Amino acid sequence: MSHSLRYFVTAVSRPGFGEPRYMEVGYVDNTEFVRFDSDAENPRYEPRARWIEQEGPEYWERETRRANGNEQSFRVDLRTALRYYNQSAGGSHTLQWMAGCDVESDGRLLRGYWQFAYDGCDYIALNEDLKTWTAADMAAQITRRKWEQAGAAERDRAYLEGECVEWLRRYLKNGNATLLATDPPKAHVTHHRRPEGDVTLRCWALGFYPAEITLTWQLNGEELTQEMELVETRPAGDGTFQKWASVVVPLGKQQKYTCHVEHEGLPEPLTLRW
């Protein structure tokens, strides 16, 4: 499991405020490099990273039409949504598109993606086998059918495997310096000796990349969850990231709980304590 090209899309039906806000975001690992925010002066595809900027006019243009077109197809979807739900014409909503490909170091994608979400819940998604859909709610059921006969997956599958994998290695091969740069976390626990007879150890993990990580605590070997506390992986801005997990402990056990840090940059899973 190594690299990916993930494209994030959001259609936001803002009733009365005009046509839904449409936006596309391009990703490789945890890096936004391209964007398309409907509400813009020059509505071209934006180079949201310097490395991609090497791409010619043929690219940005060949992409603008891509986005702009999709915006229209979404408009339809949004409109059609209400119908499928008897919902008020004056109600706002969101249609989310998440399509990408997780390609392995050698070169073969480990997984292709093409999924949907209306507002927040999963709507319909192209399964693991890359050849079949999934219907969350009854609405999606219509779609699975619609898409089955039309052979919608076939058209997609060849992208995730095609231009996705094909453009992935290129986006990397021409901007790998800027990209790749893997960083390990520099963890360490803190010990707040607050009153109430209970002290809490906080295990931070900083300066890492990729963002994707895993962090935990182990009390004398015992795994613990319904007691732990972990903040979302917040970005450090400087290409790096931060994060942490905390566990309350009775003032006097301390040596009994230990934090774990697993990350690509790390050789073995980092175990520590206070």
Partner: peptide, 10 residues
Amino acid sequence: RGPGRAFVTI
């Protein structure tokens, strides 16, 4: 390159 809703709606 990004994917495209191939005008294959809901």
